[PDB]
Design an enzyme around this catalytic site. Sequence first.
Site, PDB file in Angstrom:
ATOM      1  CB  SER A  28      31.670 -68.771 -34.842  1.00 25.13           C
ATOM      2  OG  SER A  28      31.769 -68.435 -36.163  1.00 25.13           O
ATOM      3  CB  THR A  29      27.336 -66.791 -37.735  1.00 21.43           C
ATOM      4  OG1 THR A  29      26.331 -67.814 -37.767  1.00 21.43           O
ATOM      5  CG2 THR A  29      28.406 -67.088 -38.779  1.00 21.43           C
TER       6      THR A  29
END
Lengths: 556, 556
Positions: free
Chosen positions: A360-361
């Site tokens: 998700s980064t």
Amino acid sequence: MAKLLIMSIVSFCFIFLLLLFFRYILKRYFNYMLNYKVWYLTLLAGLIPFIPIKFSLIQEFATDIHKFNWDSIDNICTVIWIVLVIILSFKFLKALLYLKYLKKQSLYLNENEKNKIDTILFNHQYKKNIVIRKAETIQSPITFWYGKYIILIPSSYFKSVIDKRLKYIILHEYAHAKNRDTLHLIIFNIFSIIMSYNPLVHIVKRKIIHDNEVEADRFVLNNINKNEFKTYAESIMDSVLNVPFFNKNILSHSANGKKSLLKRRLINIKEANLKKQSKLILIFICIFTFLLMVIQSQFLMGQSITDYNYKKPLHNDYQILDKSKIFGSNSGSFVMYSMKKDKYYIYNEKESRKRYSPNSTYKIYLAMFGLDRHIINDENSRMSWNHKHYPFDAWNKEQDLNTAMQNSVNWYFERISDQIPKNYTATQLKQLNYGNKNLGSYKSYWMEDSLKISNLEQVIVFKNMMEQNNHFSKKAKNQLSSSLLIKKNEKYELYGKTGTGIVNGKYNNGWFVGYVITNHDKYYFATHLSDGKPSGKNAELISEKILKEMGVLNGQ
Amino acid sequence: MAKLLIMSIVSFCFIFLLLLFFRYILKRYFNYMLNYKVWYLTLLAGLIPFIPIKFSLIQEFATDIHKFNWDSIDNICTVIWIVLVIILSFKFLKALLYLKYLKKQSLYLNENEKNKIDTILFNHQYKKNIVIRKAETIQSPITFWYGKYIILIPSSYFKSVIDKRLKYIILHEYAHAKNRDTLHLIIFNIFSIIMSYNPLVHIVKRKIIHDNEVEADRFVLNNINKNEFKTYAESIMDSVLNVPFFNKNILSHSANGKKSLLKRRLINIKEANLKKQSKLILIFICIFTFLLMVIQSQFLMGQSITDYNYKKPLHNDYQILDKSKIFGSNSGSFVMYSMKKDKYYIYNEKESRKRYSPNSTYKIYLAMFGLDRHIINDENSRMSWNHKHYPFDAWNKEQDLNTAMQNSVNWYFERISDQIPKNYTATQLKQLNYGNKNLGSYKSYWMEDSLKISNLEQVIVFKNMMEQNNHFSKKAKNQLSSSLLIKKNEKYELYGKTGTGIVNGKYNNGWFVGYVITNHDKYYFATHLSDGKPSGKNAELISEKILKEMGVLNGQ
Ligand SMILES: [Zn+2]
Ligand SMILES: [Zn+2]
């Protein structure tokens, strides 16, 4: 059906192997052999799976159950079997028609022909439920079943009747008749169609045939004088050497029983056409083929280098760190960078250089790309909800960018990828060195998929994103930045983003990335956990603790 | 590695097939053949995948990414290859040692032996970078490489020098030497180890060998008189017929080049031991084998009956319904039952009888079983949360039975299965006829897994659960019932439970089950949707609408 076909193969091969074992032993130690009828057990074994006997001795909320795609296995297994049986059935029928033709074309023997057969079989009072015929259409003996057990002999052997060839031929083919080999062969042959899904059916029909010929040989020896044994072997060889060799039929027995090497060699000699082929024939084929190999070389191949981690040197000055106490229970790696000094600080550099999917980064890149490309903006940082429920309760809502980023709302981000021309994204992956820049085929390829980046690369790329990227607006840079604030004090503003590499319920990638804007310098960093409980939350905690101890979040 | 090994196989087989195609054409139409060196391309083709060139022309929230278990494929593929290459390497070395032995044991020829070789090769000025040796340890010619190209000839052929056998032997083996066949063979042989993961390496070495022998034959014909062609073919046959046939080595060439049928047959004749084996040998093996087949019959098999739907009749009186208007957009089936009349009312009975996994509706059975077995109770209807997040926000909490059931909290129920002896559950599946009673191996086997039940069966079982089950307490019956209330009025109390068969994000099973207690009768029912959007919610809506129209929820 796939499972059943498989089970059948397993059942078959079990029995089959046991029999092969016995076959070996019987011959190897005793000169004994299996009674081929035993092979019916393999067929039966493979029919077992198909026998239907249980023999042995409000609020609407829901989750996704991830089952194996059996439809794509059973739908095809069914078709594969069907098509093959049709093909084999045809092949069979073709062979059958051949036999019928010969039956129709079979000739009767006269008393001076019949008496030879009688002379040969009479001594052992062999049965008369056999048929002897001759023909002008064949070169060597052929057997047929039809409930008759016909032995068709080329008419020329009724002229060449002073060399005992018939003695051997008849006893040999007779033995096959005696044991109803042709019939059994046919039955197995039919079953090889029925059970065509199992290639061992062909293996066994072949083994059976080989052994049937062996049993016939045993019979013949039992029926001839010991001083004729040599002659018989020579006769066997003559029966193949002096004839064309073709598998004219796959049901009947004949001398030319297999696609042997000798078969090929001897034919080539008979066809003694001593023509030197042009050298150009193979120059063409070889180069052509080479170029076709090149065509294969034009295609996907792997690279150890791709599989590998950042093998590259760091072009910047740096210091190696020891932060193993903080990682503690969750071993990993960590990179920090000083903008003023152009210096890197790296914990476990070998590990820091390892590439992992961003999870998700990456969304910060995805979102900021949408901002620069004018897909997503401030006034319209929001995305509509499709009313489908998502993995967290936090995600089952409409959202802006700050909310979406703070709560990792995958839905928000899935739409963003769909709304951004893929080439914009690909361009940025290339321009700013995004790890292996692998966009995969997945719209969210960074989410535990194809795109991978090291912690070192993660630091380099984000820093350059703001510091150097000249193909990206200031607004996108700053809008994104504000959405990442974690904490602040009299020295700095700490920004970042977590993500958890959770696969099949287990933690694999403890990500946390970010940067710090201080009142003296600017810092960039990336944390990754691989051991313990490598969650995004632990990565956040670890990173903060490290950065503070290193002076980043503590004024030095 | 598995992917690479596969890619290699694909690359190899592509080229391989193209070559087989050409091979066919060249011979079939022109009497031309491939220069076997071309086969190096297949080896090369299969090495391509391994060439590392990119050639072509914060709040912590997260979800589970369901990736394929490659570890179980690549870890094994790696091992499988390693083990096999070790084995093949040994086999090779064994063959090598054999060759070295013979080298050590090779004898020199004298001038009255050497001159025969010279006579044979001289006319074509063949090269002297060849070695001729003789031995007392062999029966037929063998080639060796060692950078020498040695042809070892049994010493007896230097006595039998008046039948031209040497003419053929030497030219034949010589040709192999001329073309460095032994060496190339060895190279391929080495590669068959390197590339052992691809069975086609063996296929091609065999094809190569077959063709090498063919090219040698072509050579020989080119080097002999046309009226000797027949003799040569006979000689080839004599070279195998009159000798023992063993694959003593897999590197060298020899007359006995393959495991042919004739090989087997002829040996059996030479070993003319006319012993009748005891009948008991096969009586034992056949029965034993049979019993081993029985052992396979003692094992898992499938049953069409198991795969099938309720094929059984309904023992109760019933009426068939037409409710297709209500199902509308979500086609399915529906069963209702009147306790007073002992009558069933069935929409699309053929479909009503179809068995589907129960999904979350089974939880009522799971929970009530826990209640009867004194695992779960009223005072302790609750279950502790493990602080792991679950698929819905609604599930990320501790809960009692009413909450757990109302919000379908899988966690609650997963623990309940873990806390109930499996045999208690199995006993109830049996006692009250729970569909196929298939408990699978999964603790939640009813959750889009092994247990399946028809709508008809679902109605029968629930009704009997309360009406007949004498192995289940009243408290468990009533405690569970209260947790299912949906709605009520002046005629009744409607109870039920939904569930959605959602797999890989798609709807497959629109379940809703329940019962109605009215002021005149008691009713039982089950709804299942398969088409449209077969969700649990739609099933609830559909069922209620049907039940009302049928009088169940409307006083009739
Ligand atoms: Zn035969
Ligand atoms: Zn040879």
